[PDB]
Design a protein around this ligand. Sequence first.
Ligand SMILES: O=c1ccn([C@@H]2O[C@H](COP(=O)(O)OP(=O)(O)O)[C@@H](O)[C@H]2O)c(=O)[nH]1
Ligand SMILES: O=c1ccn([C@@H]2O[C@H](COP(=O)(O)OP(=O)(O)O)[C@@H](O)[C@H]2O)c(=O)[nH]1
Ligand SMILES: O=[N+]([O-])c1ccc(O[C@@H]2O[C@H](CO)[C@H](O)[C@H](O)[C@H]2O)cc1
Ligand SMILES: O=[N+]([O-])c1ccc(O[C@@H]2O[C@H](CO)[C@H](O)[C@H](O)[C@H]2O)cc1
Ligand SMILES: [Mn+2]
Ligand SMILES: [Mn+2]
Lengths: 287, 287
Amino acid sequence: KLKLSDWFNPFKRPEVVTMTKWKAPVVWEGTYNRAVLDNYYAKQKITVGLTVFAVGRYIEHYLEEFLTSANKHFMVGHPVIFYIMVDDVSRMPLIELGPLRSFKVFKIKPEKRWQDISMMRMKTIGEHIVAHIQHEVDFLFCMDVDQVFQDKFGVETLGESVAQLQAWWYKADPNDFTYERRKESAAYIPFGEGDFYYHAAIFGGTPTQVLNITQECFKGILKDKKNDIEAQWHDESHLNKYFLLNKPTKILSPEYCWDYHIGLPADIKLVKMSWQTKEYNVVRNNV
Amino acid sequence: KLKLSDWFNPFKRPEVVTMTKWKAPVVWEGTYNRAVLDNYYAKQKITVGLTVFAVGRYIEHYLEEFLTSANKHFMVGHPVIFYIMVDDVSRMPLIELGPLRSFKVFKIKPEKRWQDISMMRMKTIGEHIVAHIQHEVDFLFCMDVDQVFQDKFGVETLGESVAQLQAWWYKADPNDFTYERRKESAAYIPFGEGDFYYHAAIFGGTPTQVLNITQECFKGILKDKKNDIEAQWHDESHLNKYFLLNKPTKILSPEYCWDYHIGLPADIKLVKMSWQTKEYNVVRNNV
Ligand SMILES: O=c1ccn([C@@H]2O[C@H](COP(=O)(O)OP(=O)(O)O)[C@@H](O)[C@H]2O)c(=O)[nH]1
Ligand SMILES: O=c1ccn([C@@H]2O[C@H](COP(=O)(O)OP(=O)(O)O)[C@@H](O)[C@H]2O)c(=O)[nH]1
Ligand SMILES: O=[N+]([O-])c1ccc(O[C@@H]2O[C@H](CO)[C@H](O)[C@H](O)[C@H]2O)cc1
Ligand SMILES: O=[N+]([O-])c1ccc(O[C@@H]2O[C@H](CO)[C@H](O)[C@H](O)[C@H]2O)cc1
Ligand SMILES: [Mn+2]
Ligand SMILES: [Mn+2]
């Protein structure tokens, strides 16, 4: 049976947070033994899933670059299935995939508001988990399209529920976090509460856990609509509320989702994924 | 460890050939216990691959219908990867896939002659086996595109090396078979020799065996080119020469690849796959 000490050494990164108060590891470059994990997971013959949405001009701007980088960097050495959700399949870039990669594409309805496009992902992911993903993979990541894999994003990131530290807020105090602060929203987190600010651009876990994550987030999204309120950062606000109540069993350092606009400080040793520059004037059609 | 008698009962179909002189089964409807095999293979967690080529007009004519039917009928209940080779990826019909199905597409060079398009498949399949397929699947089938799955085509068809009985010739005397009969060809089979006439539209096996099948067939194809000769039925002539020398460990009945132009006689109990009607005048560009 895989124990934390088998693969995780926090002492390799003494100047950062490596363990939570609930004993979940925060995975930083230097702390993980990928060789040990690759061997362990290869013997289990795991398959890892990855969902990605591209609706509207997000397709032309980001989808090819995401998928090309995912092919190269995501869980290399293990079977991987990319689940691609687009509103227009005729604009799907059909890139060549390498060994142990395969994919499938689904046509989805485009929501009128970009905010609803972002939030509806929670409903859609859950539907696909029930319909097929639960039978296909051992672990699933759900990711934003507006980012690019830069280096190996491997089995060290796998767990029962996996959260991502948002690049801008990882050193901040909880009372500075951009949680939803209105008690009328289901995403509400009071001042004096909170562990971390999680980025909604990457989350994952077992199909069972991701199903619960997305189900509970979407319930909150629906409740808010009935109360004529919309959380400040939409699905991300709801995701943060979820992970407050249901603590992630693993957290990823900002190295796994880094914004180069910040620069590259000492803490960020090897970037695995980077944000694309925002292009809202083109890719979004409403305020 | 799986034994033939665990799943195969020849006495269920007494009026047809069910066993070869080398003790390989000929799989007919009624002889196989799919429930036993589905359990056996699910516990082994197998993945089955399927290669299919569509070049030129074959894409629009046959590819969608092939894939839609394969999605529905091929190895249901088990992970499947469709490997699609086309000369124009922009013409690839991106159908919706069901649970445990995924795919990837490759751009290939279109050969000038339809005969070479058919024959070059042997080279290309081998390259892909070494490159990736050997790492991705336990068994692989290689199929023509100009045919449609009609019913369950499942784990009862899997084996070390798998051959298909050609629908028109299965009752024929070997010396009436359309083997290549010129001794100058690598595919030459003398009168007085031959077991069955095998259809090049379906063959399969383990990646190791399929690699040998395709490598040896392509070596025969290249040798013939150096000797200024082309086998009468091209890759099929070479496939028949291969299976004469290296007996298949399993044969599929004409039920697994039936031409309805013959009609539907008593022997054909449940069609799993049917030929598309030939449209050479439209789909081919040279004599
Ligand atoms: O019009 C849209 C809005 C959102 N998205 C998807 O939802 C994700 C989250 O939205 P976005 O990345 O724009 O939010 P941000 O990270 O910029 O706050 C995107 O990466 C896309 O995958 C999309 O495809 N089309
Ligand atoms: O111009 C061509 C010729 C052949 N093929 C592929 O090669 C296979 C064998 O050719 P064909 O089916 O026409 O031979 P037949 O079964 O009719 O004798 C086809 O099913 C296709 O997959 C193709 O894609 N384009
Ligand atoms: O301090 N900044 O100038 C700043 C703040 C936040 C930034 O990223 C955005 O953060 C919000 C939540 O606070 C969302 O995660 C959003 O997706 C990010 O773009 C960048 C700079
Ligand atoms: O006698 N016929 O009318 C007749 C009808 C269909 C036939 O099928 C043909 O057989 C060939 C080998 O002989 C190839 O397998 C070819 O792909 C197939 O179309 C062959 C003969
Ligand atoms: Mn984003
Ligand atoms: Mn054919």
